PDB file of C-alpha atoms and ligand atoms in Angstrom:
ATOM      1  CA  UNK A   1      -0.257  -0.253   0.221  1.00 13.02           C
ATOM      2  CA  UNK A   2       1.484   3.221  -1.113  1.00 10.04           C
ATOM      3  CA  UNK A   3       1.924   5.758   1.225  1.00 12.06           C
ATOM      4  CA  UNK A   4       1.431   8.376   3.107  1.00  9.16           C
ATOM      5  CA  UNK A   5      -2.195   7.554   5.684  1.00  6.61           C
ATOM      6  CA  UNK A   6      -4.454   9.908   6.689  1.00  6.68           C
ATOM      7  CA  UNK A   7      -3.010   9.245   9.804  1.00  2.86           C
ATOM      8  CA  UNK A   8       0.510  10.218   9.322  1.00  5.87           C
ATOM      9  CA  UNK A   9      -0.820  13.150   7.694  1.00  4.64           C
ATOM     10  CA  UNK A  10      -2.435  14.732  10.290  1.00  4.88           C
ATOM     11  CA  UNK A  11       0.012  14.235  12.847  1.00  6.43           C
ATOM     12  CA  UNK A  12       2.526  16.104  10.540  1.00  6.57           C
ATOM     13  CA  UNK A  13       0.658  18.275   9.623  1.00  9.03           C
ATOM     14  CA  UNK A  14      -0.586  19.818  13.111  1.00  7.28           C
ATOM     15  CA  UNK A  15       2.614  19.124  14.891  1.00  5.90           C
ATOM     16  CA  UNK A  16       5.952  18.912  12.949  1.00  6.92           C
ATOM     17  CA  UNK A  17       6.336  22.805  13.222  1.00  8.89           C
ATOM     18  CA  UNK A  18       5.659  22.368  17.169  1.00  8.90           C
ATOM     19  CA  UNK A  19       8.017  19.896  17.149  1.00 12.22           C
ATOM     20  CA  UNK A  20      11.395  21.600  15.176  1.00 14.65           C
ATOM     21  CA  UNK A  21      10.311  24.578  17.778  1.00 10.85           C
ATOM     22  CA  UNK A  22      11.992  22.045  20.460  1.00 12.39           C
ATOM     23  CA  UNK A  23      15.798  21.820  21.180  1.00 10.45           C
ATOM     24  CA  UNK A  24      16.020  18.337  22.187  1.00 10.08           C
ATOM     25  CA  UNK A  25      13.456  17.580  19.066  1.00 11.16           C
ATOM     26  CA  UNK A  26      16.114  15.084  17.113  1.00 11.94           C
ATOM     27  CA  UNK A  27      17.361  13.307  20.323  1.00 15.08           C
ATOM     28  CA  UNK A  28      15.267  10.159  20.124  1.00 11.97           C
ATOM     29  CA  UNK A  29      15.402   9.343  17.043  1.00 11.30           C
ATOM     30  CA  UNK A  30      18.205   7.899  14.683  1.00  8.46           C
ATOM     31  CA  UNK A  31      20.732   9.380  11.834  1.00  8.47           C
ATOM     32  CA  UNK A  32      19.003   7.530   9.308  1.00  5.65           C
ATOM     33  CA  UNK A  33      15.919   9.492  10.011  1.00  3.36           C
ATOM     34  CA  UNK A  34      17.623  12.987  11.064  1.00  2.00           C
ATOM     35  CA  UNK A  35      19.112  12.730   7.158  1.00  2.00           C
ATOM     36  CA  UNK A  36      15.158  11.757   6.007  1.00  2.00           C
ATOM     37  CA  UNK A  37      13.937  14.704   8.500  1.00  2.00           C
ATOM     38  CA  UNK A  38      16.025  16.884   6.636  1.00  2.00           C
ATOM     39  CA  UNK A  39      16.215  16.599   2.936  1.00  2.00           C
ATOM     40  CA  UNK A  40      12.409  16.886   3.742  1.00  2.00           C
ATOM     41  CA  UNK A  41      13.286  20.348   5.057  1.00  2.00           C
ATOM     42  CA  UNK A  42      14.981  21.355   2.069  1.00  2.00           C
ATOM     43  CA  UNK A  43      12.865  20.372  -0.362  1.00  2.00           C
ATOM     44  CA  UNK A  44       9.840  22.229   1.808  1.00  2.00           C
ATOM     45  CA  UNK A  45      12.585  25.602   1.581  1.00  2.00           C
ATOM     46  CA  UNK A  46      13.070  24.397  -1.992  1.00  2.00           C
ATOM     47  CA  UNK A  47       9.078  24.855  -2.856  1.00  2.00           C
ATOM     48  CA  UNK A  48       7.477  26.536  -0.266  1.00  2.00           C
ATOM     49  CA  UNK A  49      10.291  28.935   1.066  1.00  2.00           C
ATOM     50  CA  UNK A  50      10.150  29.916   4.128  1.00  2.00           C
ATOM     51  CA  UNK A  51       7.132  31.684   6.328  1.00  2.00           C
ATOM     52  CA  UNK A  52       9.187  35.033   5.770  1.00  2.00           C
ATOM     53  CA  UNK A  53      10.403  34.590   1.923  1.00  2.00           C
ATOM     54  CA  UNK A  54       7.469  32.237   0.473  1.00  2.00           C
ATOM     55  CA  UNK A  55       7.972  31.700  -2.238  1.00  2.00           C
ATOM     56  CA  UNK A  56       5.262  31.974  -5.676  1.00  2.00           C
ATOM     57  CA  UNK A  57       4.140  28.248  -5.814  1.00  2.00           C
ATOM     58  CA  UNK A  58       0.720  25.746  -6.358  1.00  2.00           C
ATOM     59  CA  UNK A  59      -1.160  26.238  -2.424  1.00  2.00           C
ATOM     60  CA  UNK A  60      -0.241  29.758  -1.793  1.00  2.00           C
ATOM     61  CA  UNK A  61      -3.987  30.668  -0.414  1.00  2.00           C
ATOM     62  CA  UNK A  62      -4.083  27.815   2.022  1.00  2.00           C
ATOM     63  CA  UNK A  63      -1.880  29.174   4.473  1.00  2.00           C
ATOM     64  CA  UNK A  64       0.032  26.650   5.494  1.00  2.00           C
ATOM     65  CA  UNK A  65       3.452  26.780   6.884  1.00  2.00           C
ATOM     66  CA  UNK A  66       6.160  25.131   3.694  1.00  2.00           C
ATOM     67  CA  UNK A  67       5.942  21.929   5.754  1.00  2.00           C
ATOM     68  CA  UNK A  68       2.332  21.463   5.790  1.00  2.00           C
ATOM     69  CA  UNK A  69       1.987  22.218   2.206  1.00  2.00           C
ATOM     70  CA  UNK A  70       5.117  19.635   1.159  1.00  2.00           C
ATOM     71  CA  UNK A  71       2.953  17.027   3.917  1.00  2.00           C
ATOM     72  CA  UNK A  72       0.081  17.659   2.210  1.00  2.00           C
ATOM     73  CA  UNK A  73       1.634  17.348  -1.205  1.00  2.00           C
ATOM     74  CA  UNK A  74       2.799  13.756  -0.477  1.00  2.00           C
ATOM     75  CA  UNK A  75       0.235  12.477   0.508  1.00  2.00           C
ATOM     76  CA  UNK A  76      -2.270  13.534  -2.667  1.00  2.00           C
ATOM     77  CA  UNK A  77       0.639  11.920  -5.214  1.00  2.00           C
ATOM     78  CA  UNK A  78       0.253   9.207  -2.168  1.00  2.00           C
ATOM     79  CA  UNK A  79       3.365   7.189  -3.342  1.00  2.00           C
ATOM     80  CA  UNK A  80       5.420   7.236  -0.994  1.00  2.00           C
ATOM     81  CA  UNK A  81       7.741   3.409  -0.046  1.00  2.00           C
ATOM     82  CA  UNK A  82      10.055   1.867   1.560  1.00  2.00           C
ATOM     83  CA  UNK A  83      11.715   5.180   1.990  1.00  2.00           C
ATOM     84  CA  UNK A  84       9.933   7.908   3.174  1.00  2.00           C
ATOM     85  CA  UNK A  85      10.454  10.316   5.661  1.00  2.00           C
ATOM     86  CA  UNK A  86       7.469   9.946   7.065  1.00  2.00           C
ATOM     87  CA  UNK A  87       8.315   7.565   9.692  1.00  2.00           C
ATOM     88  CA  UNK A  88      11.242   9.450  11.145  1.00  2.00           C
ATOM     89  CA  UNK A  89       8.570  12.540  11.447  1.00  2.00           C
ATOM     90  CA  UNK A  90       6.003  10.530  13.328  1.00  2.00           C
ATOM     91  CA  UNK A  91       8.791   9.736  15.543  1.00  2.00           C
ATOM     92  CA  UNK A  92       9.039  13.032  15.796  1.00  2.00           C
ATOM     93  CA  UNK A  93       5.841  13.900  16.164  1.00  2.00           C
ATOM     94  CA  UNK A  94       5.707  11.222  19.038  1.00  2.00           C
ATOM     95  CA  UNK A  95       8.906  12.861  20.977  1.00  2.00           C
ATOM     96  CA  UNK A  96       7.672  15.498  21.103  1.00  2.00           C
ATOM     97  CA  UNK A  97       4.504  14.365  22.386  1.00  2.00           C
ATOM     98  CA  UNK A  98       5.817  12.451  25.372  1.00  2.00           C
ATOM     99  CA  UNK A  99       7.618  15.542  25.949  1.00  2.00           C
ATOM    100  CA  UNK A 100       4.847  18.516  25.747  1.00  2.00           C
ATOM    101  CA  UNK A 101       1.846  16.454  25.554  1.00  2.00           C
ATOM    102  CA  UNK A 102      -1.071  15.765  22.536  1.00  2.00           C
ATOM    103  CA  UNK A 103      -1.165  18.810  20.931  1.00  2.00           C
ATOM    104  CA  UNK A 104      -4.540  19.100  20.056  1.00  2.00           C
ATOM    105  CA  UNK A 105      -6.119  21.718  16.976  1.00  2.00           C
ATOM    106  CA  UNK A 106      -7.413  24.935  18.050  1.00  2.00           C
ATOM    107  CA  UNK A 107      -9.993  26.795  16.393  1.00  2.00           C
ATOM    108  CA  UNK A 108      -8.190  28.870  13.844  1.00  2.00           C
ATOM    109  CA  UNK A 109      -5.836  26.162  13.069  1.00  2.00           C
ATOM    110  CA  UNK A 110      -5.352  25.613   9.685  1.00  2.00           C
ATOM    111  CA  UNK A 111      -8.370  22.030   8.822  1.00  2.00           C
ATOM    112  CA  UNK A 112      -6.889  18.748   7.037  1.00  2.00           C
ATOM    113  CA  UNK A 113      -9.487  18.340   5.438  1.00  2.00           C
ATOM    114  CA  UNK A 114      -9.520  22.017   3.211  1.00  2.00           C
ATOM    115  CA  UNK A 115      -5.513  21.910   3.520  1.00  2.00           C
ATOM    116  CA  UNK A 116      -6.236  18.540   1.096  1.00  2.00           C
ATOM    117  CA  UNK A 117      -8.868  19.982  -1.072  1.00  2.00           C
ATOM    118  CA  UNK A 118      -7.739  23.182  -1.724  1.00  2.00           C
ATOM    119  CA  UNK A 119      -4.013  21.908  -2.808  1.00  2.00           C
ATOM    120  CA  UNK A 120      -6.172  19.259  -5.046  1.00  2.00           C
ATOM    121  CA  UNK A 121      -8.686  21.680  -6.019  1.00  2.00           C
ATOM    122  CA  UNK A 122      -4.912  23.675  -7.107  1.00  2.00           C
ATOM    123  CA  UNK A 123      -4.006  20.535  -9.012  1.00  2.00           C
ATOM    124  CA  UNK A 124      -7.330  20.098 -11.052  1.00  2.00           C
ATOM    125  CA  UNK A 125      -7.313  23.332 -12.102  1.00  2.00           C
ATOM    126  CA  UNK A 126      -4.229  23.418 -13.421  1.00  2.00           C
ATOM    127  CA  UNK A 127      -5.081  20.551 -15.294  1.00  2.00           C
ATOM    128  CA  UNK A 128      -8.955  21.736 -16.671  1.00  2.00           C
ATOM    129  CA  UNK A 129      -7.443  24.517 -18.053  1.00  2.00           C
ATOM    130  CA  UNK A 130      -4.689  23.208 -19.595  1.00  2.00           C
ATOM    131  CA  UNK A 131      -6.927  20.805 -20.843  1.00  2.00           C
ATOM    132  CA  UNK A 132      -9.822  23.571 -22.216  1.00  2.00           C
ATOM    133  CA  UNK A 133      -6.004  25.536 -23.638  1.00  2.00           C
ATOM    134  CA  UNK A 134      -5.738  22.081 -25.522  1.00  2.00           C
ATOM    135  CA  UNK A 135      -8.767  22.656 -27.704  1.00  2.00           C
ATOM    136  CA  UNK A 136      -7.789  24.899 -29.354  1.00  2.00           C
ATOM    137  CA  UNK A 137      -5.019  24.591 -31.499  1.00  2.00           C
ATOM    138  CA  UNK A 138      -5.092  28.192 -32.329  1.00  2.00           C
ATOM    139  CA  UNK A 139      -5.111  31.636 -29.990  1.00  2.00           C
ATOM    140  CA  UNK A 140      -4.570  34.750 -29.863  1.00  2.00           C
ATOM    141  CA  UNK A 141      -0.719  35.252 -30.917  1.00  2.00           C
ATOM    142  CA  UNK A 142       1.435  34.923 -28.093  1.00  2.00           C
ATOM    143  CA  UNK A 143       5.517  34.526 -27.447  1.00  2.00           C
ATOM    144  CA  UNK A 144       6.541  32.089 -23.819  1.00  2.00           C
ATOM    145  CA  UNK A 145       8.413  35.562 -22.033  1.00  2.00           C
ATOM    146  CA  UNK A 146      11.277  35.518 -21.410  1.00  2.00           C
ATOM    147  CA  UNK A 147      12.774  34.104 -17.619  1.00  2.00           C
ATOM    148  CA  UNK A 148       9.213  32.838 -16.298  1.00  2.00           C
ATOM    149  CA  UNK A 149      10.060  30.288 -13.915  1.00  2.00           C
ATOM    150  CA  UNK A 150       5.911  29.619 -14.794  1.00  2.00           C
ATOM    151  CA  UNK A 151       7.073  28.333 -18.929  1.00  2.00           C
ATOM    152  CA  UNK A 152       8.979  25.944 -17.294  1.00  2.00           C
ATOM    153  CA  UNK A 153       5.684  23.989 -14.881  1.00  2.00           C
ATOM    154  CA  UNK A 154       2.833  25.211 -17.490  1.00  2.00           C
ATOM    155  CA  UNK A 155       4.871  22.757 -21.054  1.00  2.00           C
ATOM    156  CA  UNK A 156       5.341  20.488 -18.997  1.00  2.00           C
ATOM    157  CA  UNK A 157       1.927  19.852 -17.630  1.00  2.00           C
ATOM    158  CA  UNK A 158       0.710  20.258 -20.987  1.00  2.00           C
ATOM    159  CA  UNK A 159       2.957  17.034 -22.612  1.00  2.00           C
ATOM    160  CA  UNK A 160       1.611  15.277 -18.961  1.00  2.00           C
ATOM    161  CA  UNK A 161      -1.799  15.798 -20.557  1.00  2.00           C
ATOM    162  CA  UNK A 162      -0.754  14.369 -24.501  1.00  2.00           C
ATOM    163  CA  UNK A 163       0.336  11.575 -22.545  1.00  2.00           C
ATOM    164  CA  UNK A 164      -2.653  10.763 -20.781  1.00  2.00           C
ATOM    165  CA  UNK A 165      -4.332  11.594 -23.974  1.00  2.00           C
ATOM    166  CA  UNK A 166      -6.921  13.439 -21.912  1.00  2.00           C
ATOM    167  CA  UNK A 167      -6.981  16.331 -24.912  1.00  2.00           C
ATOM    168  CA  UNK A 168      -7.571  14.356 -28.875  1.00  2.00           C
ATOM    169  CA  UNK A 169      -4.895  12.301 -30.218  1.00  2.00           C
ATOM    170  CA  UNK A 170      -3.270  14.871 -33.167  1.00  2.00           C
ATOM    171  CA  UNK A 171      -2.936  18.177 -31.876  1.00  2.00           C
ATOM    172  CA  UNK A 172       0.506  20.397 -31.133  1.00  2.00           C
ATOM    173  CA  UNK A 173       1.649  22.342 -28.511  1.00  2.00           C
ATOM    174  CA  UNK A 174       2.054  26.114 -29.591  1.00  2.00           C
ATOM    175  CA  UNK A 175       3.499  28.750 -27.525  1.00  2.00           C
ATOM    176  CA  UNK A 176       0.388  30.065 -27.437  1.00  2.00           C
ATOM    177  CA  UNK A 177      -0.557  27.132 -25.243  1.00  2.00           C
ATOM    178  CA  UNK A 178       3.049  27.405 -22.624  1.00  2.00           C
ATOM    179  CA  UNK A 179       1.783  31.265 -22.417  1.00  2.00           C
ATOM    180  CA  UNK A 180      -1.100  30.988 -22.121  1.00  2.00           C
ATOM    181  CA  UNK A 181      -1.223  28.143 -19.351  1.00  2.00           C
ATOM    182  CA  UNK A 182       1.954  30.325 -17.457  1.00  2.00           C
ATOM    183  CA  UNK A 183      -0.940  32.922 -17.529  1.00  2.00           C
ATOM    184  CA  UNK A 184      -3.157  31.315 -15.436  1.00  2.00           C
ATOM    185  CA  UNK A 185       0.195  29.439 -13.154  1.00  2.00           C
ATOM    186  CA  UNK A 186       1.253  32.850 -12.464  1.00  2.00           C
ATOM    187  CA  UNK A 187      -1.960  34.370 -10.853  1.00  2.00           C
ATOM    188  CA  UNK A 188      -2.917  30.908  -9.542  1.00  2.00           C
ATOM    189  CA  UNK A 189       1.366  31.344  -8.092  1.00  2.00           C
ATOM    190  CA  UNK A 190      -0.030  33.807  -5.876  1.00  2.00           C
ATOM    191  CA  UNK A 191      -3.520  33.802  -3.399  1.00  2.00           C
ATOM    192  CA  UNK A 192      -5.972  35.412  -6.241  1.00  2.00           C
ATOM    193  CA  UNK A 193      -7.307  31.579  -5.928  1.00  2.00           C
ATOM    194  CA  UNK A 194      -8.745  29.621  -8.766  1.00  2.00           C
ATOM    195  CA  UNK A 195     -11.493  31.636 -10.669  1.00  2.00           C
ATOM    196  CA  UNK A 196      -9.358  35.055 -10.869  1.00  2.00           C
ATOM    197  CA  UNK A 197      -7.396  33.068 -12.776  1.00  2.00           C
ATOM    198  CA  UNK A 198      -9.708  31.257 -14.747  1.00  2.00           C
ATOM    199  CA  UNK A 199     -10.754  34.624 -15.789  1.00  2.00           C
ATOM    200  CA  UNK A 200      -8.059  36.209 -15.678  1.00  2.00           C
ATOM    201  CA  UNK A 201      -6.965  33.708 -18.218  1.00  2.00           C
ATOM    202  CA  UNK A 202     -10.468  33.811 -19.660  1.00  2.00           C
ATOM    203  CA  UNK A 203     -10.284  37.158 -21.118  1.00  2.00           C
ATOM    204  CA  UNK A 204      -6.685  37.340 -22.985  1.00  2.00           C
ATOM    205  CA  UNK A 205      -7.187  33.890 -24.398  1.00  2.00           C
ATOM    206  CA  UNK A 206     -11.601  34.662 -24.988  1.00  2.00           C
ATOM    207  CA  UNK A 207     -11.970  30.540 -24.530  1.00  2.00           C
ATOM    208  CA  UNK A 208     -15.402  31.365 -22.813  1.00  2.00           C
ATOM    209  CA  UNK A 209     -15.537  28.065 -20.806  1.00  2.00           C
ATOM    210  CA  UNK A 210     -12.604  28.112 -18.946  1.00  2.00           C
ATOM    211  CA  UNK A 211     -14.917  29.295 -16.203  1.00  2.00           C
ATOM    212  CA  UNK A 212     -17.052  26.360 -15.839  1.00  2.00           C
ATOM    213  CA  UNK A 213     -14.449  23.952 -16.260  1.00  2.00           C
ATOM    214  CA  UNK A 214     -12.941  25.316 -13.148  1.00  2.00           C
ATOM    215  CA  UNK A 215     -15.884  26.408 -11.303  1.00  2.00           C
ATOM    216  CA  UNK A 216     -16.499  22.535 -11.505  1.00  2.00           C
ATOM    217  CA  UNK A 217     -13.386  21.954 -10.285  1.00  2.00           C
ATOM    218  CA  UNK A 218     -14.545  23.248  -7.210  1.00  2.00           C
ATOM    219  CA  UNK A 219     -17.870  21.003  -6.884  1.00  2.00           C
ATOM    220  CA  UNK A 220     -14.952  18.520  -6.475  1.00  2.00           C
ATOM    221  CA  UNK A 221     -13.557  16.977  -3.475  1.00  2.00           C
ATOM    222  CA  UNK A 222      -9.892  14.514  -2.594  1.00  2.00           C
ATOM    223  CA  UNK A 223     -12.466  12.055  -0.699  1.00  2.00           C
ATOM    224  CA  UNK A 224     -15.404  11.553  -3.561  1.00  2.00           C
ATOM    225  CA  UNK A 225     -16.518   8.019  -3.648  1.00  2.00           C
ATOM    226  CA  UNK A 226     -16.129   5.490  -6.732  1.00  2.00           C
ATOM    227  CA  UNK A 227     -14.189   5.656 -10.130  1.00  2.00           C
ATOM    228  CA  UNK A 228     -15.165   9.497 -10.195  1.00  2.00           C
ATOM    229  CA  UNK A 229     -13.379  10.625  -7.082  1.00  2.00           C
ATOM    230  CA  UNK A 230     -10.564   7.934  -7.725  1.00  2.00           C
ATOM    231  CA  UNK A 231     -10.556   9.114 -11.167  1.00  2.00           C
ATOM    232  CA  UNK A 232      -9.964  12.958  -9.843  1.00  2.00           C
ATOM    233  CA  UNK A 233      -7.264  11.847  -7.291  1.00  2.00           C
ATOM    234  CA  UNK A 234      -5.051  10.042 -10.337  1.00  2.00           C
ATOM    235  CA  UNK A 235      -4.865  13.793 -12.026  1.00  2.00           C
ATOM    236  CA  UNK A 236      -3.693  15.753  -8.823  1.00  2.00           C
ATOM    237  CA  UNK A 237      -1.158  13.172  -8.180  1.00  2.00           C
ATOM    238  CA  UNK A 238      -0.216  13.049 -11.439  1.00  2.00           C
ATOM    239  CA  UNK A 239      -0.513  16.934 -11.996  1.00  2.00           C
ATOM    240  CA  UNK A 240       1.630  17.353  -8.386  1.00  2.00           C
ATOM    241  CA  UNK A 241       4.087  15.057  -9.038  1.00  2.00           C
ATOM    242  CA  UNK A 242       4.663  16.844 -12.228  1.00  2.00           C
ATOM    243  CA  UNK A 243       5.522  20.028 -10.748  1.00  2.00           C
ATOM    244  CA  UNK A 244       7.237  18.451  -8.674  1.00  2.00           C
ATOM    245  CA  UNK A 245       9.142  16.987 -11.309  1.00  2.00           C
ATOM    246  CA  UNK A 246       9.907  20.387 -12.302  1.00  2.00           C
ATOM    247  CA  UNK A 247      10.037  22.033  -9.353  1.00  2.00           C
ATOM    248  CA  UNK A 248      13.005  20.132  -7.912  1.00  2.00           C
ATOM    249  CA  UNK A 249      15.618  19.984 -10.942  1.00  2.00           C
ATOM    250  CA  UNK A 250      15.326  23.987 -11.650  1.00  2.00           C
ATOM    251  CA  UNK A 251      16.760  23.980  -8.020  1.00  2.00           C
ATOM    252  CA  UNK A 252      19.960  22.092  -8.129  1.00  2.00           C
TER     253      UNK A 252
HETATM  254 CL1   CL B   1      -5.040   6.338   3.916  1.00  2.00          CL
HETATM  255 CL1   CL B   2       9.755  27.576   8.066  1.00  2.00          CL
HETATM  256 CL1   CL B   3     -10.357  25.929  -0.908  1.00  2.00          CL
HETATM  257 CL1   CL B   4      -9.224  27.526 -32.958  1.00  2.00          CL
HETATM  258 CL1   CL B   5       3.869   8.851 -24.566  1.00  2.00          CL
HETATM  259 CL1   CL B   6      -0.483  38.208 -11.504  1.00  2.00          CL
END
């Protein structure tokens, strides 16, 4: 069974930051597990930055720490095998639990299911936008700007959607698709929300259906049942995995 589980995500989501703010946090676990928490914190900064230096990336309007975003990020991907850093994180939370007690989320803490659904809808909005764009192989002419990180993200998403055969087999990824999806992502990577990104992209492209498509995303949840709920969980896992591979390659 691929990890991480909802229980594992819960312990890390609500107490990993509070556990790291304790002096003897690593005194409970081993060296190989320190090295696992090491890379997890490294990638959290490489993807989302700091609480004071936040990078522009997906899940920007969720009000989550970089560790909380990354934990939700891996749970949606749901491909942690035997080399997962989560048991090291759980044992870190366990040691904090032995010292300062069990931490219960306060009434103004992030809601876990909303944190999952927010990142899950962000991933579906980007993919469903790239899907709507590829349905038109001719759009108002634009060129991809010179130095935009959203170019690498947008290109990888469009190429991945061709591999999924969600777009009609035969179409071409034109520079208009790369540029207009990058405009959606640049807005989405702010705190503007999916609707503000869909409407702004629909203004530029003229794709009228682009707004209602993102609206149907908001009618979905990462906990839906049946083949439909699993099909959306697969899309969100793929899109987030596509953006993850790019962001980790450009950071090296
Ligand atoms: Cl689970
Ligand atoms: Cl931080
Ligand atoms: Cl949301
Ligand atoms: Cl067309
Ligand atoms: Cl292929
Ligand atoms: Cl913007």
